[PDB]
Amino acid sequence: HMQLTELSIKNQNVFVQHYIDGKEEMSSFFDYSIHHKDMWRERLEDLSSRFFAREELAAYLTSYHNKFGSSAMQSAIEKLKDPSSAAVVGGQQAGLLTGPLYTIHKIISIIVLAKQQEKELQVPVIPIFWVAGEDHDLDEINFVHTSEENGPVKKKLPQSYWKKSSAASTSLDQEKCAAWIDDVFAAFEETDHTNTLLDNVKRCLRESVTFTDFFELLIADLFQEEGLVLLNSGDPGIKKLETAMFQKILRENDELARAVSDQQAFMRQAGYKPIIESGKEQANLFYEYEDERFLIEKDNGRFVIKELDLGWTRDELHTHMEEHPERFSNNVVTRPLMQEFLIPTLAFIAGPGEINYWGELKQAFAVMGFKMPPVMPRLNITILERHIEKKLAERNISLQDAIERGTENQRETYFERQIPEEFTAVMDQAKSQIEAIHKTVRQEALKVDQSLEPLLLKNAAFIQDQLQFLERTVMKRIEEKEGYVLKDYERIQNSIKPLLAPQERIWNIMYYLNRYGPKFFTTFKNLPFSFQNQHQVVKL
Amino acid sequence: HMQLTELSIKNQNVFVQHYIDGKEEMSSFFDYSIHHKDMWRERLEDLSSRFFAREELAAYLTSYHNKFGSSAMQSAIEKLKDPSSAAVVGGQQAGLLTGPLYTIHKIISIIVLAKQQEKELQVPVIPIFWVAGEDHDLDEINFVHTSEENGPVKKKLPQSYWKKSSAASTSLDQEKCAAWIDDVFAAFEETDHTNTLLDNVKRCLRESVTFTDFFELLIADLFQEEGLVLLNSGDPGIKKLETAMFQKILRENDELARAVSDQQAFMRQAGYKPIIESGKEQANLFYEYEDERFLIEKDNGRFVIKELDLGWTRDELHTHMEEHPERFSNNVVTRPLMQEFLIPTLAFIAGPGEINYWGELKQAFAVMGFKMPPVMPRLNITILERHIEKKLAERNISLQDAIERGTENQRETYFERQIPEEFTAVMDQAKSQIEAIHKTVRQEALKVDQSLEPLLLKNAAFIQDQLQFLERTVMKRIEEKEGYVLKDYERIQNSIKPLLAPQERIWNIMYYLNRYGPKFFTTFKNLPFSFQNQHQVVKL
Ligand SMILES: Nc1ncnc2c1ncn2[C@@H]1O[C@H](COP(=O)(O)OP(=O)(O)O)[C@@H](O)[C@H]1O
Ligand SMILES: Nc1ncnc2c1ncn2[C@@H]1O[C@H](COP(=O)(O)OP(=O)(O)O)[C@@H](O)[C@H]1O
């Protein structure tokens, strides 16, 4: 049976660790403390004073979700009409094949938190996944890692984009994407699960047009049972509902840019590293023209797009937003403000990057007139396959050590212990003694002609090169002799900390579905995860 | 002034040395002793019982020599009609430009001996040079040595021969031979003598048709004053006079071949090395057909030419000799017998090869019914140029040592004395100590994997190669540093014992005429040489 364990592992980002630890200084960066049990009721009471267009949102969502044919999704959306309901929201880009595992872990986080709070608070709490379909960074979503001879390599979908178009409006080349899927799967070991899985994934592709369509369909197959609601930020249909918040962003635009710059300075001053790159020429909105996305920038009280020589006064842009809301979209700064406008948010589920940059946005929320919602760290998970757990034990490596720093230093220690002790010492001594002997010869030779010196020093270096080559040869032979053990260090790392990054950032769910099957995933989803800020280890 | 000195130098051929020393056993190999003063009168008395066709020979020679326009040659030939006269004879091949210096030394020997005996005996004694014009070995005569960067090199006349024709009947390509002469002279330093000499040599060429014509003309220019008589064995004109001796060779042919084979065995048995290659199938005559020369061989009492499918009975060949004597010619074995038939010979002047092979012919002479004439060693000469004598002194080499063995061993000793003593010892020690150190490393490496051994032994040998290359480099630098001295050892050898052979075998008179002029040659000819069997050194 599958087992859940925990480990206490520090985040390498000191801001995120301080947040997780509940430092007093975090009230300068966040509006709700996740460290007191009664915060959730307080959050609900704060939400009861806000106005949402719940019927309109629910009708849009209902209409959007008719493509999935899921009574569970529809029953979730129906709960949004109850004025006491709220949602747990988190989001990701629309990675091909669902992208990195942290996308799955995030969705699990949303669903688990929403269920736990529905039970504790006794109001409906809906799990919403925010598909970042407005985003035009297709290089972030157009590949998965595959495992090759030297380790993980990006396998990119072979399709180029002329237009800088959003994920939600970029079409997939059906034939190229099907071939790519075959190429990803061809790297796996074939199992009893392979054909059915590959058929299901290809079915989802042929029912898609865009990157977001395909992502949604896979996610619905995986989670519709749990009643997960999908909100695609790049769907033209949602834009009408966003009009007044685009207009609010416009009206408070100068105050917003000030709020970002001041918070970022404060963060830098407190000892931390802001990551949002958005100066005071930025309106923090994008405009779509001819299927492409352009930055809106500021020029002495006006709004401009420099690449298209377009501009607007504030009043002209306000009217333009009313008439054509579908042309507008948010950036990193404004997306969270739009989320909070649209959705009655009990909690936002955040990864470590998002925790850092949400701390940059505290004053931004205030400029828009509402609190930052509570920010709950998503679950951080490592899947420990049984053959990897066996190898950790065989190589005398502690699980926590592997998760924190991989296996490279351990491997290097093992290899060195295979070099006989007396080799190193005699090799060191030989280099030095041979050079001393050679020097005595050069001393005699030089009495013939001082102009020999360069040639004599070349000769000495050539001999030392031979000795180095000898040493390199003996090391290569040890590498060969010990190759089966040494490869096990590499296998452990490849699984747990590929490229010295966390498993959940590098790998993807398809490997695991292919190897372990649907019953694995069902069990995995339903494990008793908890939000105590501990690293979760799922032992297969 | 030019000075004559002597040195006592042993011949490397023990037979020739024993002859020169007057060993008792030499009466098995020769008919007259050159070691008793009264032999010359005895020889004259033996000749007074022989019949020669002196008027016929003198008329032929007179007619032949009209091309030279020399009253001195003609006055010499006139002496042959005196029934008391005799000749000193010696011979050589018709080398281009007069061939090796020993050709000049031989002619000097003939002229000096003839003059000395004319004075002592008070009968006319004529100097005759036997031009070996019948010989078809053009590769022996179609070049001279020239001095190039690595020492003496043969410079061959660029002309090929289809026909295996005699020197006396082979035409020179006028244009190719003039070019070749220019190329030989171009290697000399130009002097005040050059143009006149080159003009004289080219004049002789344009007055020649054949190899023998050119040789004779040069020799006449050099010696006609002394009344040297030229007998060209390959002139058709002389053949009629030879008829009866061709016929005698025929009649006694079986006895001749037996005489050669028995003497050769005896010589081998006495401890010496016969050099004539002529078995019992050999008639020891050649036949000329269509300008080419063919061996006459024997086949069960008949005479055959195998290559032309021609044969004769003895009686048929006898008649053929009478009708066509011009078609016949002698080989190494029969030439001396023909010489003795034709010319009343007081003495034969011989080089060291000829002394050896004349010893093979003692019984051959007897089969023909006459004694072998006295064999006088020709003068062996070294010309010592003043700059070479200076260099011998500077390099601490004794003249005799240089003449006996060149300068190579001395040069090698000088060079070694320039290698510091402590270099050799430290280089030797280093090779050994480095290999001992490297071995200790290989001993440690091999504990990893025994299959490394070849690679480890390769590594060790590569290092030892570096040390050898170091040593070779230091030696090359010493060679450069000492290059002016070392080159002087080489210069001395190049002059005195080029290619470790005697000067007189390798070099040629033109270099000396070009450098030193006609006055040099006049003086050289007239030096007081003596026949005491000592090496003659002519100091310029
Ligand atoms: N695509 C993948 N996603 C996640 N983990 C992987 C993937 N491929 C391999 N692994 C893990 O990494 C380990 C080492 O993989 P690898 O070196 O490719 O091959 P193997 O272990 O089969 O020789 C695997 O045993 C597995 O646990
Ligand atoms: N063609 C030659 N015949 C005879 N002796 C020669 C000839 N050429 C050179 N020599 C002799 O050999 C010596 C060495 O000659 P070589 O090395 O050619 O040139 P050099 O001495 O002029 O540098 C000369 O100095 C001379 O005494």
Side-chain angles (χ1 to χ4, degrees), chain A residues 2-23 26-36 39-148 151-159 165-272 274-385 387-480 482-483 485-486 488-532 534-540, chain B residues 2-23 26-36 39-148 151-159 165-272 274-385 387-480 482-483 485-486 488-532 534-540:
Chain A
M2 186 169 316
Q3 179 184 159
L4 179 61
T5 321
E6 327 130 72
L7 294 170
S8 183
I9 292 175
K10 277 185 160 144
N11 200 275
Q12 62 143 320
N13 180 321
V14 311
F15 187 79
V16 173
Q17 196 50 46
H18 289 172
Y19 184 61
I20 287 165
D21 290 330
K23 255 63 216 205
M26 289 295 149
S27 67
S28 291
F29 294 96
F30 297 93
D31 286 323
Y32 294 87
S33 174
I34 58 175
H35 306 281
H36 86 276
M39 181 270 282
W40 300 111
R41 206 131 233 148
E42 175 188 322
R43 177 61 180 172
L44 278 187
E45 182 134 32
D46 286 348
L47 285 171
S48 80
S49 79
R50 290 276 305 282
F51 299 86
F52 295 90
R54 302 173 101 105
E55 286 291 330
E56 295 81 359
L57 180 61
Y60 165 62
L61 292 170
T62 292
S63 184
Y64 194 75
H65 284 67
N66 277 330
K67 69 188 170 156
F68 301 125
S70 171
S71 72
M73 295 173 128
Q74 293 295 0
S75 303
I77 293 164
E78 210 61 30
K79 297 186 193 176
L80 290 171
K81 298 172 188 194
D82 184 334
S84 80
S85 62
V88 175
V89 185
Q92 213 68 71
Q93 290 165 276
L96 285 172
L97 300 179
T98 77
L101 283 162
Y102 61 58
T103 307
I104 300 309
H105 309 333
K106 180 172 282 175
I107 288 173
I108 292 163
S109 302
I110 298 165
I111 293 166
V112 168
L113 187 59
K115 259 198 197 125
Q116 289 184 357
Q117 292 307 306
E118 178 159 302
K119 185 154 183 264
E120 177 66 47
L121 299 169
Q122 302 175 256
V123 305
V125 181
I126 299 103
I128 301 181
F129 183 78
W130 182 280
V131 176
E134 73 198 323
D135 188 63
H136 62 283
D137 196 354
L138 309 181
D139 291 337
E140 207 123 42
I141 67 177
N142 69 340
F143 68 93
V144 295
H145 285 101
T146 186
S147 195
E148 297 184 355
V153 171
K154 291 196 181 69
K155 186 187 286 309
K156 289 262 167 166
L157 168 65
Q159 173 192 312
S165 49
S166 74
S169 68
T170 306
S171 306
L172 289 172
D173 186 312
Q174 289 284 318
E175 190 155 26
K176 295 275 177 277
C177 191
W180 174 85
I181 294 163
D182 291 332
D183 286 346
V184 169
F185 274 67
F188 304 153
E189 197 70 356
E190 217 170 291
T191 70
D192 286 350
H193 308 295
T194 299
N195 286 336
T196 291
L197 175 63
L198 199 48
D199 293 342
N200 286 332
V201 171
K202 279 181 163 180
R203 180 196 50 67
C204 289
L205 179 56
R206 81 176 51 102
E207 299 178 1
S208 298
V209 181
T210 64
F211 275 89
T212 61
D213 283 342
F214 186 32
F215 176 88
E216 289 173 339
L217 286 161
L218 295 175
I219 289 302
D221 266 358
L222 294 170
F223 293 102
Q224 65 77 26
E225 174 152 6
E226 319 309 351
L228 180 71
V229 180
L230 304 177
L231 178 311
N232 176 349
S233 57
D235 177 62
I238 194 159
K239 304 287 187 171
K240 183 54 127 110
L241 296 170
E242 294 179 356
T243 305
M245 186 61 193
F246 284 132
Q247 284 173 330
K248 177 72 171 171
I249 288 159
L250 177 59
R251 179 163 64 99
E252 305 308 323
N253 207 257
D254 297 346
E255 295 76 0
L256 178 62
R258 269 182 245 118
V260 167
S261 56
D262 285 351
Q263 186 71 2
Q264 284 190 320
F266 176 95
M267 185 171 288
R268 284 214 139 269
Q269 287 158 11
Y272 307 114
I275 63 189
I276 291 172
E277 294 179 347
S278 165
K280 285 182 123 209
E281 74 288 356
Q282 293 315 299
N284 296 114
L285 290 175
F286 289 90
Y287 185 74
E288 177 185 328
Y289 171 84
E290 296 260 353
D291 313 315
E292 295 201 285
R293 216 186 175 215
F294 300 82
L295 273 167
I296 308 175
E297 297 180 279
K298 312 167 77 169
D299 190 341
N300 296 271
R302 290 178 300 117
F303 296 80
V304 301
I305 301 173
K306 285 163 148 185
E307 179 185 347
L308 300 169
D309 298 295
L310 287 173
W312 295 269
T313 64
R314 193 169 67 180
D315 285 353
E316 292 153 359
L317 189 49
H318 180 99
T319 300
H320 196 47
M321 285 177 166
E322 179 77 42
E323 305 181 332
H324 282 287
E326 72 293 343
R327 296 194 186 165
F328 291 84
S329 63
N330 292 115
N331 80 163
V332 68
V333 164
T334 51
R335 193 215 70 77
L337 311 172
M338 187 68 66
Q339 182 191 276
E340 177 65 25
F341 169 82
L342 214 42
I343 298 161
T345 303
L346 185 61
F348 171 69
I349 295 292
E354 296 171 296
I355 291 163
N356 194 107
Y357 80 64
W358 276 60
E360 310 170 41
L361 305 176
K362 202 253 228 293
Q363 298 189 48
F365 276 91
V367 155
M368 303 300 157
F370 41 44
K371 282 170 149 63
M372 187 192 309
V375 175
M376 177 70 45
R378 65 161 173 84
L379 300 163
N380 306 107
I381 300 168
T382 299
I383 306 172
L384 182 64
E385 303 177 73
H387 69 284
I388 302 299
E389 183 188 39
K390 193 166 192 163
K391 294 172 192 303
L392 283 160
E394 296 167 343
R395 306 285 95 243
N396 309 304
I397 302 166
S398 180
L399 176 62
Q400 178 169 339
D401 188 35
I403 288 174
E404 291 201 76
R405 62 175 202 145
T407 68
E408 279 173 3
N409 300 102
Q410 305 97 312
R411 186 197 182 281
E412 294 177 29
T413 300
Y414 174 80
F415 176 86
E416 293 186 0
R417 105 190 204 213
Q418 313 306 132
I419 299 170
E421 309 171 59
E422 289 301 285
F423 180 72
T424 288
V426 315
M427 189 73 255
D428 278 331
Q429 266 296 337
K431 289 178 181 160
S432 141
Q433 284 168 45
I434 289 178
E435 162 54 28
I437 288 161
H438 192 280
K439 189 175 182 200
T440 71
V441 176
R442 305 195 293 270
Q443 286 163 349
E444 300 307 315
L446 277 169
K447 299 196 292 205
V448 166
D449 186 359
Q450 171 76 31
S451 71
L452 283 167
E453 179 147 59
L455 252 70
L456 295 170
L457 290 178
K458 190 155 106 281
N459 196 268
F462 213 77
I463 288 163
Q464 292 297 318
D465 293 340
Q466 288 294 304
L467 294 180
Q468 293 169 183
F469 182 85
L470 191 150
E471 186 171 356
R472 188 205 62 93
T473 296
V474 177
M475 298 306 167
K476 179 128 199 217
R477 193 63 46 95
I478 297 170
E479 177 103 355
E480 281 163 16
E482 293 277 11
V485 172
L486 290 166
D488 282 341
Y489 287 88
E490 295 165 0
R491 290 176 175 110
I492 292 157
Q493 184 163 291
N494 195 63
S495 178
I496 292 184
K497 206 79 183 292
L499 308 178
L500 301 181
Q503 185 188 80
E504 68 186 0
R505 303 198 79 84
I506 301 305
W507 296 128
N508 161 265
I509 200 56
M510 296 301 166
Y511 164 82
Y512 306 91
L513 302 173
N514 181 74
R515 185 155 182 162
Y516 298 105
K519 297 140 93 210
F520 143 81
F521 191 71
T522 301
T523 304
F524 181 79
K525 285 197 281 190
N526 283 300
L527 259 7
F529 302 109
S530 93
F531 291 92
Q532 225 160 336
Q534 318 280 43
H535 193 89
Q536 314 283 291
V537 176
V538 178
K539 308 191 163 174
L540 272 17
Chain B
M2 186 169 316
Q3 179 184 159
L4 179 61
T5 321
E6 327 130 72
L7 294 170
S8 183
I9 292 175
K10 277 185 160 144
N11 200 275
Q12 62 143 320
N13 180 321
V14 311
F15 187 79
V16 173
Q17 196 50 46
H18 289 172
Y19 184 61
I20 287 165
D21 290 330
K23 255 63 216 205
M26 289 295 149
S27 67
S28 291
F29 294 96
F30 297 93
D31 286 323
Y32 294 87
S33 174
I34 58 175
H35 306 281
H36 86 276
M39 181 270 282
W40 300 111
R41 206 131 233 148
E42 175 188 322
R43 177 61 180 172
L44 278 187
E45 182 134 32
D46 286 348
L47 285 171
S48 80
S49 79
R50 290 276 305 282
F51 299 86
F52 295 90
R54 302 173 101 105
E55 286 291 330
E56 295 81 359
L57 180 61
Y60 165 62
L61 292 170
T62 292
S63 184
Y64 194 75
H65 284 67
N66 277 330
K67 69 188 170 156
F68 301 125
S70 171
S71 72
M73 295 173 128
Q74 293 295 0
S75 303
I77 293 164
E78 210 61 30
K79 297 186 193 176
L80 290 171
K81 298 172 188 194
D82 184 334
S84 80
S85 62
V88 175
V89 185
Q92 213 68 71
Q93 290 165 276
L96 285 172
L97 300 179
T98 77
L101 283 162
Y102 61 58
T103 307
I104 300 309
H105 309 333
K106 180 172 282 175
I107 288 173
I108 292 163
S109 302
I110 298 165
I111 293 166
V112 168
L113 187 59
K115 259 198 197 125
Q116 289 184 357
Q117 292 307 306
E118 178 159 302
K119 185 154 183 264
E120 177 66 47
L121 299 169
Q122 302 175 256
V123 305
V125 181
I126 299 103
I128 301 181
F129 183 78
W130 182 280
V131 176
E134 73 198 323
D135 188 63
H136 62 283
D137 196 354
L138 309 181
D139 291 337
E140 207 123 42
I141 67 177
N142 69 340
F143 68 93
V144 295
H145 285 101
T146 186
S147 195
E148 297 184 355
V153 171
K154 291 196 181 69
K155 186 187 286 309
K156 289 262 167 166
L157 168 65
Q159 173 192 312
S165 49
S166 74
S169 68
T170 306
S171 306
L172 289 172
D173 186 312
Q174 289 284 318
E175 190 155 26
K176 295 275 177 277
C177 191
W180 174 85
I181 294 163
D182 291 332
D183 286 346
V184 169
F185 274 67
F188 304 153
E189 197 70 356
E190 217 170 291
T191 70
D192 286 350
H193 308 295
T194 299
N195 286 336
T196 291
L197 175 63
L198 199 48
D199 293 342
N200 286 332
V201 171
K202 279 181 163 180
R203 180 196 50 67
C204 289
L205 179 56
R206 81 176 51 102
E207 299 178 1
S208 298
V209 181
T210 64
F211 275 89
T212 61
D213 283 342
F214 186 32
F215 176 88
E216 289 173 339
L217 286 161
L218 295 175
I219 289 302
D221 266 358
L222 294 170
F223 293 102
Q224 65 77 26
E225 174 152 6
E226 319 309 351
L228 180 71
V229 180
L230 304 177
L231 178 311
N232 176 349
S233 57
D235 177 62
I238 194 159
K239 304 287 187 171
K240 183 54 127 110
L241 296 170
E242 294 179 356
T243 305
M245 186 61 193
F246 284 132
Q247 284 173 330
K248 177 72 171 171
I249 288 159
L250 177 59
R251 179 163 64 99
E252 305 308 323
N253 207 257
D254 297 346
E255 295 76 0
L256 178 62
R258 269 182 245 118
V260 167
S261 56
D262 285 351
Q263 186 71 2
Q264 284 190 320
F266 176 95
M267 185 171 288
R268 284 214 139 269
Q269 287 158 11
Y272 307 114
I275 63 189
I276 291 172
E277 294 179 347
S278 165
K280 285 182 123 209
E281 74 288 356
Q282 293 315 299
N284 296 114
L285 290 175
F286 289 90
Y287 185 74
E288 177 185 328
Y289 171 84
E290 296 260 353
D291 313 315
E292 295 201 285
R293 216 186 175 215
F294 300 82
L295 273 167
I296 308 175
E297 297 180 279
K298 312 167 77 169
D299 190 341
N300 296 271
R302 290 178 300 117
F303 296 80
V304 301
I305 301 173
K306 285 163 148 185
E307 179 185 347
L308 300 169
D309 298 295
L310 287 173
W312 295 269
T313 64
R314 193 169 67 180
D315 285 353
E316 292 153 359
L317 189 49
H318 180 99
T319 300
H320 196 47
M321 285 177 166
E322 179 77 42
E323 305 181 332
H324 282 287
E326 72 293 343
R327 296 194 186 165
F328 291 84
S329 63
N330 292 115
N331 80 163
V332 68
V333 164
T334 51
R335 193 215 70 77
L337 311 172
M338 187 68 66
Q339 182 191 276
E340 177 65 25
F341 169 82
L342 214 42
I343 298 161
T345 303
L346 185 61
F348 171 69
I349 295 292
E354 296 171 296
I355 291 163
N356 194 107
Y357 80 64
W358 276 60
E360 310 170 41
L361 305 176
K362 202 253 228 293
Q363 298 189 48
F365 276 91
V367 155
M368 303 300 157
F370 41 44
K371 282 170 149 63
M372 187 192 309
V375 175
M376 177 70 45
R378 65 161 173 84
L379 300 163
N380 306 107
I381 300 168
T382 299
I383 306 172
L384 182 64
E385 303 177 73
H387 69 284
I388 302 299
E389 183 188 39
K390 193 166 192 163
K391 294 172 192 303
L392 283 160
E394 296 167 343
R395 306 285 95 243
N396 309 304
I397 302 166
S398 180
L399 176 62
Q400 178 169 339
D401 188 35
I403 288 174
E404 291 201 76
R405 62 175 202 145
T407 68
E408 279 173 3
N409 300 102
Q410 305 97 312
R411 186 197 182 281
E412 294 177 29
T413 300
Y414 174 80
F415 176 86
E416 293 186 0
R417 105 190 204 213
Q418 313 306 132
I419 299 170
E421 309 171 59
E422 289 301 285
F423 180 72
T424 288
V426 315
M427 189 73 255
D428 278 331
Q429 266 296 337
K431 289 178 181 160
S432 141
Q433 284 168 45
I434 289 178
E435 162 54 28
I437 288 161
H438 192 280
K439 189 175 182 200
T440 71
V441 176
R442 305 195 293 270
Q443 286 163 349
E444 300 307 315
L446 277 169
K447 299 196 292 205
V448 166
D449 186 359
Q450 171 76 31
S451 71
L452 283 167
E453 179 147 59
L455 252 70
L456 295 170
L457 290 178
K458 190 155 106 281
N459 196 268
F462 213 77
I463 288 163
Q464 292 297 318
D465 293 340
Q466 288 294 304
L467 294 180
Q468 293 169 183
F469 182 85
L470 191 150
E471 186 171 356
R472 188 205 62 93
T473 296
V474 177
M475 298 306 167
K476 179 128 199 217
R477 193 63 46 95
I478 297 170
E479 177 103 355
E480 281 163 16
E482 293 277 11
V485 172
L486 290 166
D488 282 341
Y489 287 88
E490 295 165 0
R491 290 176 175 110
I492 292 157
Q493 184 163 291
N494 195 63
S495 178
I496 292 184
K497 206 79 183 292
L499 308 178
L500 301 181
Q503 185 188 80
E504 68 186 0
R505 303 198 79 84
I506 301 305
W507 296 128
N508 161 265
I509 200 56
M510 296 301 166
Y511 164 82
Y512 306 91
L513 302 173
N514 181 74
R515 185 155 182 162
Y516 298 105
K519 297 140 93 210
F520 143 81
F521 191 71
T522 301
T523 304
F524 181 79
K525 285 197 281 190
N526 283 300
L527 259 7
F529 302 109
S530 93
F531 291 92
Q532 225 160 336
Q534 318 280 43
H535 193 89
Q536 314 283 291
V537 176
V538 178
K539 308 191 163 174
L540 272 17

